[PDB]
Design a protein around this ligand. Structure first.
Ligand SMILES: [Cl-]
Ligand SMILES: [Cl-]
Ligand SMILES: [Cl-]
Ligand SMILES: [Cl-]
Ligand SMILES: [Cl-]
Ligand SMILES: [Cl-]
Ligand SMILES: [K+]
Ligand SMILES: [K+]
Lengths: 375, 358, 358, 375
């Protein structure tokens, strides 16, 4: 018997089984409703310091593989699930879940009532928690640790996940037939986009490349001056974990761009930053948006998009500066999902766009880029 | 799981192919594949209690039969898949013959090994931890009973003892991201229960028929729905119990509370335990609920309408003849033969032509 | 591996039990169990090249026959085990029926898998790295050949091409802790060769007859020994090739150099290759070496004594009849029928009683 | 394809497959002829800094188990074998050999011509070497390390395997039936024996207790003074790695005791020390003795013993002090194996004793400890 334990700030306990590394894990507890895509979720920087509970019971059915990695590493602090399948069964699998978790040193637990956990987070909002896996997991220790956890509110996580040096990215989307393509060459891409790495996902980058963009990935703190120096065709503000607010660095920089005529496009954290720099205010969500079936309305078009959400904070619509037009809202909860500057080539989206490869956001960005080079 | 009726079709090719031959279907919900599958099995109304064996372990011919059943599927395949594991066949083995994904096979295989332990340890080895692990894998009391060599009630007793009972989760469309005001539930072995039964009213429970089959059609479902609409309108809290995905009775709108469950004693008793209803109708879902009538009554269930015993009075050919007699009515000449020559003799009495009922 | 003769025994219970029924035995030496085992298989003189199949993949009854053979061992169980794996039985399944330790069964299973890859890739999939791996698992040229659908010779050529040959280790009682002056060797596919043939003398190779069987006894072994002792005395460097553990022939004293190996074209050629003997006597070991005569010669082996063709002259019922004819001697009336009706006729000619030789 | 490689000082290469930890290992390369007892060999301190090659092709047939560790840990530098079995198949097995190797982090290679290795070591003598298990093992690098290796000649290994602080040992020998017996009670043991942990094997200890010996396990350095300070019934000097010569610290000590009337018993390393302390000289063997089929004669009784041997150095018979009687000799090479002080209650044995439930030796010992208390 390989025991594991998960304990919530509030004292709630969940007894189960260890499936990952031995040890303990602490962080903010969230639930994600995605029925598929666990790997991508685990490896999404957007989950740093978070303990991920998946609502879908069998997690690990298709094992894992490199192509499904959203970053160079597992960002989830822990994984909490109802059942770990006996086998991974899929032509793409290269290593079962459990072995993967272990290789990445992730503390994971299985066999607990995820539904009860979900309903609790839903009802009472997120909570910090600690999972302990090993011989005789100490529930008090667990509880201590959970209670001691500082918490994501006011925590700058982007500086934690961002890259240390800047670098190129010219690799596009994966395909069934040929997997991940070779990285394109620079003369093979018309556009040059500077993308701020606030804990960016591989798939977004891949998308942009799909659209003609050579990317220069820059650290989160990178100055505006430093960047402008690069004569960027467009500026992209990635997705990323934690609170946007304490990102003094970014906001500053962004404001600069906003003086300029350079197209600016933001996703998730970027979107929050853009909003902050535009004078808007951000809030931290009861439990957030973590799933892949979230309905969002494009108000302009009056169409609904089924989206992927991975956020715990959000831009308050009520404090929206008037140079900020609302472009999209959540059909689940009425929260802000899109915005555009009425006075600048800058817009952003709360959810996480994906490749087909209708790409209206992306295409817009590209559109703005062109107009900009047309000038 | 589809429901077949090949037994009623003499000369019919009974192998499964692109042209449907099933007459109905049963559905089940569980927190895990294993649990879900086994619950469906016991709710199939074919006499199964899970993976009950089709061929004997000593039949030197088994492997052959098994192979065949796997390679060219019939209505019985799922049971032969387990017997294959029991017989020594490998998951790859089984796969190559069936093309059924290993993901599913490994799970069936695991249930089998578990049944083996059960078998090995007997009831005595059925401690609370193990038993809970079994229940969580969807094992029926009945199936366990069989493996341990005891009556079904014995297993159930043991659970009572250990306070080992299921919880009820709700269907919500959203993995619990939003709350529900609807009471569309399924049982499982977990921590938190969402049944939250009302103490408020007088409840009426209606038992459906499970999957449809020939002679056990929509006609019964119709009746079951009607009982609910009527009694609800009249102000009762109506509870429906059924597991046929095709019917109106399994429509959440049809009743106050819906338990999408196997229409078995075990499952029905659990709900009753918690609902503590005022009455239970067993007369409208066909043979399925009918057959449960005595055990339910005996187990304390407030069965309403025509009593189990009265139903048995009518159903039982002997008990019955006696009524007919009693009332001095006209029944056709009958006899209960055991041996051939016996029947030839009695036949003579009765008079041809004859109706020979097993 | 024991050697049986049940075919000579009509009516005889052929299951193995506590009472011995074998007539001889063969021994093999390998650097690994698989190597060792497969070598023994190909030296058993029963027409096996390794785990040759006993039942067809497509036989519907194959699982059953396989089960019986497994549960109640016969001389052929070793083959049925491979067959079991082919058919999809699991290692645990085979274990249950045979009680053979899994450490062994797993190795057979691996062998079977590799076989299957061969079958799959064909002669073309036989790259140097893979061939080498197979040869180290004890795979015989002949066996791979059937799997790949080619002539054993093709495989042989293939290895030539790849400079893929075995090395020779020596027996020494002490795991190489001390040096040996004796030349008691066995083949393996490894790095270092310990053969160190002499360039010195004239070498004479004597081929033994493998395990003893009825009609192929010690009498031939007696001869083989004599050949050695004799020539050795005469001053030739004698080299014995045999793998029967019971005999004087396999005693390191009996000869200058002993190669404890399977008496097969394959194994012999490898020795010849490095020994380059003056001659090779194939007439003293009975049937085994005899049947290799042609092929050895054809491969350039220096066969001394009565020629392989000559032998062929006398063995060949027709070749012979002609010479008997030639010599003007007395042979019994004979005929070569194909058809029954054809026989009864010829029969009348020849005249009963009759000796019918298949 | 998990490559590995072994290279000898001499440049000899051995290509194979990785079956242990990833990485490199270096030390003296030795060969062991034991067809059984691999776990026991791996966990024997006598192997520190030594890379172990096993003559017996299939290593790992019975997996592993704690009852089979001769010490707290695996001391062997690396493991070299011909074949790692597909499964372990024994009722006592708790963990396959490969998994065992990893957890203990041992670099190890399977599938090489261990015979080839053996003969070379036998012919030319022991050799330092390097194993490199990884993605693309570097031959030159491995050679580079191999050559660089300092070597065991003149190396004190005892001080590296000894214990920090002293301790009590009251555990007896294993039985099939009971297994590892509970640890006797101090008051349950007649005698008190002090044992210098020169990297001592568990079983030997077990064999003493078996004999009624309470035990005090001390560190290598340990002063005679401090020792004598515990009024020990007899002193025992354990087996251990490296060269005995450089262990000034004990020769000294020993010599103390050697003026005393306390009985002193030495095994392997401790048999060497005794020797030194008594004036004899020690040499380093061409290839040493490693395996379990070694014939040794009890000259006194003219009988032969089949022993277990784990040594690289010996005691030179030619340089013996009169007060040193030769009690045993190797029937394999006529080397020294046992000695007894003419003038003192001291004697030692080169080979390694084992329980049936050496008995002679062991019994003698006690019979000495006895005659000593009788006084
Ligand atoms: Cl739980
Ligand atoms: Cl790139
Ligand atoms: Cl148990
Ligand atoms: Cl017989
Ligand atoms: Cl290959
Ligand atoms: Cl090698
Ligand atoms: K649990
Ligand atoms: K009826």
């Amino acid at each position: 018997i390989k025991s594991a334990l998960l304990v919530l700030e509030d004292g709630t306990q969940f007894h189960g089984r260890a499936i990952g590394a031995t040890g303990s894990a602490v962080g903010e507890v969230v639930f994600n409703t995605s029925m598929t895509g666990y790997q991508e979720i685990l490896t999404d920087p957007s989950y740093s310091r978070q303990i991920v509970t998946l609502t879908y019971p069998h997690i690990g059915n298709v094992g894992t593989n490199d192509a499904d990695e959203e970053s160079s590493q597992v960002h989830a602090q822990g994984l909490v699930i109802r059942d770990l399948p006996l086998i991974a069964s899929n032509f793409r699998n290269t290593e079962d879940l459990s072995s993967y978790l272990k290789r990445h040193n992730i503390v994971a637990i299985a066999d607990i009532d995820t539904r009860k956990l979900t309903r609790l987070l839903r009802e009472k909002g997120a909570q910090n928690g600690c999972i302990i896996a090993g011989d005789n997991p100490d529930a008090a220790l667990a509880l201590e640790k959970a209670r001691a956890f500082p918490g994501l509110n006011g925590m700058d996580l982007a500086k934690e996940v961002t890259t240390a040096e800047a670098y190129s990215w010219t690799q596009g989307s994966w395909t069934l037939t040929g997997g991940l393509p070779q990285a394109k060459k620079e003369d093979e891409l018309p556009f040059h986009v500077v993308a701020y790495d606030f804990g960016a996902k591989r798939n977004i980058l891949r998308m942009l490349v799909d659209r003609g963009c050579r990317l220069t990935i820059v650290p989160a703190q990178t100055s505006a001056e430093d960047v402008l120096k690069m004569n960027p065709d467009g500026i992209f503000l990635s997705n990323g974990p934690g609170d946007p607010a304490p990102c003094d660095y970014a906001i500053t920089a962004i404001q600069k761009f906003l003086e300029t005529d350079i197209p600016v496009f933001g996703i998730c954290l970027g979107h929050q930053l853009l909003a902050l720099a535009s004078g808007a205010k951000t809030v931290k969500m009861k439990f957030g948006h973590h799933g892949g079936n979230h309905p969002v309305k494009d108000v302009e078009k009056n169409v609904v998009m089924i989206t992927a959400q991975n956020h715990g904070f959000a831009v308050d619509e009520a404090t929206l500066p008037a140079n900020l037009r609302v472009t999209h809202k959540s059909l689940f909860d009425g929260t802000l999902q899109g915005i555009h500057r009425t006075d600048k080539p800058a817009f952003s989206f709360q959810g996480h766009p994906e490749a087909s490869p209708a790409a209206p956001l992306f295409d817009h960005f590209i559109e703005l880029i062109e107009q900009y080079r047309k000038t | 799981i589809p429901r077949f009726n090949f037994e009623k079709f003499a000369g019919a090719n009974d192998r499964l192919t692109t042209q449907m031959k099933s007459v109905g279907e049963v559905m089940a919900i569980g927190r895990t594949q294993q649990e879900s599958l086994q619950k469906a099995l016991r709710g199939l109304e074919v006499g199964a209690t899970g993976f009950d064996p089709k061929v004997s372990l000593d039949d030197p011919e088994a492997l052959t039969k098994i192979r065949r059943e796997l390679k060219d599927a019939g209505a019985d395949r799922i049971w032969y898949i387990a017997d294959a594991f029991r017989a020594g066949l490998s998951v790859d083995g089984v796969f190559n013959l069936t093309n059924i994904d290993r993901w599913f096979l490994v799970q069936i295989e695991e249930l089998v090994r578990l049944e083996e332990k059960v078998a090995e340890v007997g009831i005595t080895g059925l401690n609370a931890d193990f038993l809970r692990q079994l229940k969580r894998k969807g094992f029926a009391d009945a199936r366990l009973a069989k493996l341990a060599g005891v009556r079904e009630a014995e297993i159930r007793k043991l659970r009572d003892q250990y306070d080992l009972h299921p919880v009820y989760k709700r269907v919500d469309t959203c993995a619990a991201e939003f709350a529900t005001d609807t009471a569309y539930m399924y049982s499982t072995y977990e921590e938190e229960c969402e049944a939250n039964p009302s103490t408020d009213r007088e409840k009426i429970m209606v038992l459906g028929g499970g999957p449809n089959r020939i002679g056990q059609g929509i006609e019964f479902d119709y009746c079951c729905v009607h009982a609910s609409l009527a009694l609800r309108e009249d102000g009762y809290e109506t509870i429906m119990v059924n597991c046929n995905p095709e019917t109106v009775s399994t429509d959440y709108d049809t009743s106050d509370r819906l338990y999408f469950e196997p229409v078995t004693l075990e499952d029905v008793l659990e709900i009753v335990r918690i609902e503590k209803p005022k009455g239970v109708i067993v007369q409208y879902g066909g043979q399925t609920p009918l057959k449960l009538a005595r055990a339910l009554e005996a187990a304390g269930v407030p069965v309403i309408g025509t009593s189990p015993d009265a139903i048995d009075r009518a159903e039982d050919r002997e008990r019955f003849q006696h009524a007919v007699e009693r009332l001095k009515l006209k029944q056709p000449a009958n006899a209960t033969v055991t041996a051939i020559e016996m029947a030839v003799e009695k036949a003579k009495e009765i008079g041809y032509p004859l109706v020979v009922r097993p």
